[PDB]
């Protein structure tokens, strides 16, 4: 059991337990007033301060209040400033601070907290592992990598640090190098290693290198509840949504959108072509490490349900056209973008993040031959003026082996079986 | 991310909101 009472607190252990018993009993209002009195009588008490913060924490959960919780987050820190604070109490208070900071989206704050923790406990490997996550949550894979390298130099068989190290490696396109860490890290069974991200990226890493054992891991990931199936490997999912690789316009119910895209396809093309000719800079190279080779760029009109205003100044009639269809402009888990691929481009088999969207492709400029797209076990081609519809949460693959460039328009829609409340509540992706 | 799943986290947390 932890040692949370310094010698001073032991002289008031009776009052401390009385207050804590109230909170443990569930009487939060009067327990807060207890610890508040205790912090009043003994401002130098670390346990009275910690009990105040826990009660504020319990109050925030009850009222579902972020503001109340931010109070607790500050009180957790004050514990650290008081005289002669027991190590167990200090670590417990700053860890909950960081945890709650992450809960609120204060990732920069959680990071500073984790950094202070690591200095106060340089032998605690778990705090380093947690620090690495702090860096990952901000997108700082460089400092995150250093952290896990400093962990594995001391504890090289910690699986938690292995999977996170391998994840960072594959993110950096160290395909072969990431496979052992990801594999060994999952095989350890350590807490935190049973994460669909590692199964996903392990198998995908194997695919790229040719290791046919990948689908053995995909199946395992399906057994552990990460993937809806071996072929549909998205991780941000609403369970129960109809799952099939290819849809028809009628099956989606978005038939007025499909009609509007197909009837006005030349307009959509010409505005895309005009941006290509007069503003190539608005087309951005694919930057998700999905290409084996070739030229692939995208010009994005909508993302996360946000209209890109400068992009729409280059395709203004197309954006206006699309505004009549909230099923796609309001899709906060998809995009609306032009997509150009040049000859000699192969796109790795990959999967989208979420099964809450369906992906329409409107063909704009389709070379007579060389271009095709696979989703799951069906390969199809594009047609100028025609819409394809597939679920990109299924594995899909693309080839551009033509003599000239290939332009399409990509329009994501909410999965039709999603309710209006889910379309307004799901966090953006 | 957008077309793939190569980032540690894709969503943002906002407490109880
Ligand atoms: O735009 C392309 O040519 C390839 N498209 C995709 O991979 C997709 O829409 O998910
Ligand atoms: Mn794709």
Numbering used by the authors:
A (entry chain A): 330 to 758
B (entry chain C): 253 to 269
List passages from the publication reporting this PDB structure.
We thus synthesised an irreversibly-linked cyclic analogue of the Cys3–4 EGFD disulfide substrate; A 10mer cyclic peptide (CP101–110) comprising the core residues (aa 101–110) of hFX EGF139mer, wherein the Cys3–4 disulfide was replaced by a stable thioether, was prepared using the method of Suga et al.. CP101–110 was efficiently Asp-β-hydroxylated by AspH-TPR-Ox (~85%), whereas cyclic peptides with variations in consensus sequence residues or a linear 10mer peptide were not, further supporting the crystallographically observed Cys3–4 disulfide as the preferred substrate form for AspH catalysis. An extended 19mer CP (CP101–119) was designed based on the enzyme-substrate contacts observed in the AspH-TPR-Ox:hFX structure and found to be a better substrate than CP101–110 (>95%). A structure of AspH co-crystallised with the CP101–119 (AspH-TPR-Ox:CP101–119) reveals this substrate bound to one of the two AspH molecules in the asymmetric unit (chain A). Conformational differences between the bound (chain A) and unbound (chain B) (Cα RMSD 3.82 Å) are consistent with afore-described observations implying an AspH induced fit mechanism with hFX.
Here, we report crystallographic and biochemical results on the structure and substrate selectivity of AspH. The results reveal a key role for the TPR domain of AspH in substrate binding and, unexpectedly, that the preferred EGFD-substrates of AspH have a non-canonical (Cys3–4) disulfide pattern. Whilst the oxygenase domain fold of AspH is typical for the 2OG oxygenase superfamily, details of its active site and the role of the TPR domain in EGFD-substrate binding are remarkable. Whatever the precise extent of conformational changes during catalysis, the results reveal a central role for the TPR domain in enabling AspH catalysis—without it, 2OG turnover occurs, but EGFDs are not hydroxylated.
